[PDB]
Ligand binder design. Structure first.
Ligand SMILES: [Au+]
Ligand SMILES: [Au+]
Ligand SMILES: [Au+]
Length: 129
């Protein structure tokens, strides 16, 4: 599923990402834009043979099992295909674990490079939240 900006804002807010670990809703929307272009089906291979999955490009190296990242961790206790569904529940609940692990949203390279320090509020402009 490819979410509209305000649609994803509203889902992310409903799923309790609004100021989660102090990260305003705009930060999460911005991350999802530049990680996946709001596409729940997005998959991208990493140099180490791991793969990033879903609207928040969660990495098989640590967070999920994709059956082809041998000697990796599955810290969200899911198959990586769960991260690709039209329902963002599994991506959100796993993101909450990632962001909480002491690195905050720096785990998202696109967030760090394209969102961090910027006017992220612009990403929720116009939305009825
Ligand atoms: Au959720
Ligand atoms: Au949802
Ligand atoms: Au994020």
């Amino acid at each position: 599923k490819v979410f509209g900006r305000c649609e994803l804002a509203a889902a992310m807010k409903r799923h309790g990402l609004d100021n989660y670990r102090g990260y305003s809703l705009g930060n999460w929307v911005c991350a999802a834009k530049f990680e996946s272009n709001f596409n729940t089906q997005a998959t991208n291979r990493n140099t180490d043979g791991s793969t990033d999955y879903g609207i928040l490009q969660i990495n098989s190296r640590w967070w999920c099992n994709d059956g082809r990242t041998p000697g990796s961790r599955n810290l969200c206790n899911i198959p990586c295909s769960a991260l690709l569904s039209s329902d963002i529940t599994a991506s959100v609940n796993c993101a909450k674990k990632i962001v909480s692990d002491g690195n905050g949203m720096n785990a998202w390279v696109a967030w760090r490079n394209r969102c961090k320090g910027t006017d992220v509020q612009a990403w929720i402009r116009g939305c009825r939240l």
